[PDB]
Each structure stands twice: as C-alpha cells, then as structure tokens.
Design a protein around this ligand. Structure first.
Ligand SMILES: [Cu+2]
Ligand SMILES: [Cu+2]
Ligand SMILES: [Cu+2]
Ligand SMILES: [Cu+2]
Lengths: 78, 276
C-alpha cells in the first residue's frame, strides 16, 4: 500500500501528503498548497525534485527536506 | 578533443570555458539543457520507463548529453572542451575549481547565494530561469548536507565491480552502474550532487556549471572501468521492457544507441587514462 496521508506545520509552512515532463507517482505532496514533485525508489525511500539525489525514508521526510531546502521560498508549480 | 582535469587548466583555458558557458546562457541555449535534464529526472522511474537515470543507460545517456553540451560550447569557441572534476582528489572548498576565476565558491549561509565567480547572481550574467522555486540566483552549500566527498579508496572499490549492471536495472541493482550512480553502496555520483548543494542537489542541477565537470569525471570513471574489465560490457543486450538495451535507441535523440557511445575515443580522449 501507499503511505498514509499527513498534514502538519513544519518550520512555519503547511506540508501535506496523500495517496493519489514528469512521472507517475501514486502519492502527492504539497508545500503551502503548491504541489511538490516526489518519487518513490524501489527500496521504499523517497526523493523530491528539490532533493533528487538524496533518499529519505518517507514522503513526509521528503516534504520536510524540501521546506529545509527552500529557506522560505515559495515553490513553483511543476 | 582532449578532456582535461580542471585542476590543470591554464588561465586562458579557464577564461575561454567561462566565456563560452556564459554565451550559451546569454543566447538561451544553456537553459534548454537544464530543462531536458529536469524532464528526464522527473520521468525516469524504477518501475517504469527509465533512460537518463536509475538505469543502465545513465552512463551512455549522460555521455551523449555532455557531448551535446560540449559541441554547443565549441560552436562558440572551438578550442573549448569539457574539463573534469576529480572530486576524490580536489575535495575541499579551497580547490582552485571554486576560485573566483573559475566557478566561484560556496554560498553565503543566510540564503545559499554564491557571491563570487563569473556565475554569481550579482554579475547579471547567470539568471536562474529553469527552476522549481522563486529563487533566481545560483546557490551552493559545499559540504553542507553531507560531510565528505567520495575518497579514492571508495572509488577503487566501485571500479573493481565486474558486472556493468544487473536486473532489475534500477536503483536497487547491484553492479557497477548503480554503485557509480550511488543508489547502493558507498555512493559516488549522487553524493557529489548532495555535497555541492544548491541547485546541484535538485532536478535542475545543470543550472550549476559544475554539473558538467562532475559528469565528465563520472564519464571518465566509466572509461576507467572499461579498461579494468575488458571482458565486461553494457547490459542488457535485448528485449528488456522499460530499459534501454544495448542496440536500442535513446530519447531524446532517438538516433543513437548505447552501442554507439561505449567507446569514448570516437569523440574525445582524456589527458590521462591508464591502460589495461
Ligand atoms: Cu522524480
Ligand atoms: Cu542527471
Ligand atoms: Cu548527476
Ligand atoms: Cu587482462
């Protein structure tokens, strides 16, 4: 099965995840309501387009890593 | 064309490489390389079609992408070739790579902005246009997100792997390609992207000109592996769904196969490449 959904405020920003030029993805992540491209690796880990060489265990971890990367910057829709 | 270790370029060579890169940026050509790479990074998946990354064609695909970029550079200045960055050796921020006469240094701590070198946003000459967030300036955090670049010993461990790639031909594979790419093992190529940080850690990593020098050394390590293993060759060799087999053509070009790219000497040589 896909991971569970999530919704929290992380470093002042709303991150959400939910099961569902770029790929499939059976999972969607948003940062302040803007979709963040994320992808699942064969081993179960996740990456996003702003950390695409750095596997993290879960989609929330990928959302949080994107907030850390963005340093307050609005995401652009993909 | 000879590809040289960046650490050995003369002042004139550095100057001409920087100027050719900036002219490709000015003319709009540079950004379309950034966009091509991001499209493939976002579409290559372990369970579906995969061509530029996480798959056997990661190496020939980047070889041809770098050849496209080198040819575009040469269209501006035919003397210029892509240099390579041996990150096993030049592993500190004090490498001349990161000097103001070449690529510029790390980003300031507030916002990651590169403040010197020819690609600093303040020059007016390096807008970040193909991007996934609002920021339009080049960013780096050298050594920020991972402490250390791969070491020579770590590279040697990867070069000793005899099989080119193995089923399932994706980020879970054993074999040389995936250990070089870095999804399994001590991690070579992926970890360098993470160590530079900034746009180099993202799907729009060719925004940083170091992308090319990184991939030129990854490409040299493929050549080195071929010399250590003359009895090993690209796999798979036919009929594999979702994966570019040896004699199948590759997107976006559609007119070239891994088979056409195995021998770099058809296109370029290195300043030094040990024999078998
Ligand atoms: Cu992706
Ligand atoms: Cu790539
Ligand atoms: Cu890369
Ligand atoms: Cu022999």
């Amino acid at each position: 099965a896909a991971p569970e959904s999530f919704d929290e405020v992380y470093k002042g920003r709303r991150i959400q995840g939910r099961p569902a030029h770029e790929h499939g993805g059976g999972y969607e992540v948003f940062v302040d309501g803007v979709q963040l491209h994320v992808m699942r690796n064969a081993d179960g880990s996740w990456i996003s387009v702003v950390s695409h060489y750095d596997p993290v265990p879960t989609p929330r971890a990928a959302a949080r890593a994107a907030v850390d990367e963005l340093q307050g910057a609005p995401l652009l829709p993909f | 064309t000879v590809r040289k270790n960046q650490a050995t370029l003369t002042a004139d060579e550095k100057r001409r490489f920087v100027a050719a890169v900036l002219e490709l940026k000015r003319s709009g050509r540079y950004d379309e390389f950034v966009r091509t790479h991001n499209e493939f990074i976002m579409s290559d998946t372990d369970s579906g079609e995969r061509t530029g990354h996480r798959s056997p064609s990661f190496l020939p695909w980047h070889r041809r992408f770098l050849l496209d970029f080198e040819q575009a550079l040469q269209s501006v200045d035919s003397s210029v070739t892509l240099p390579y960055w041996d990150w096993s050796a030049d592993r500190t921020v004090r490498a001349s790579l990161w000097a103001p006469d070449f690529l510029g240094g790390t980003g300031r701590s507030t916002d990651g902005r590169v403040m010197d070198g020819p690609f600093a946003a303040s020059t007016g000459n390096w807008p970040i246009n193909v991007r996934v967030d609002s920021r339009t300036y080049l960013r780096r955090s050298l050594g920020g997100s991972v402490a250390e670049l791969p070491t020579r010993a770590e590279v040697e461990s990867v070069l000793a792997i005899s099989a080119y790639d193995l089923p399932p031909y994706n980020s879970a594979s054993e074999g040389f390609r995936n250990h070089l790419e870095g999804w399994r093992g001590v991690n070579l190529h992926n970890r360098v992207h993470v160590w530079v940080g900034g746009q180099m850690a993202t799907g729009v990593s060719p925004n940083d000109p170091v992308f090319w020098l990184h991939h030129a050394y990854v490409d040299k390590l493929w050549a080195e592996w071929q010399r250590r293993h003359p009895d090993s060759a690209y796999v798979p060799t036919g009929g594999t769904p979702d994966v570019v087999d040896l004699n199948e053509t590759m997107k976006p070009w559609n007119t070239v196969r891994p088979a056409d790219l195995l021998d770099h000497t058809a296109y370029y040589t290195f300043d030094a490449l040990e024999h078998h």
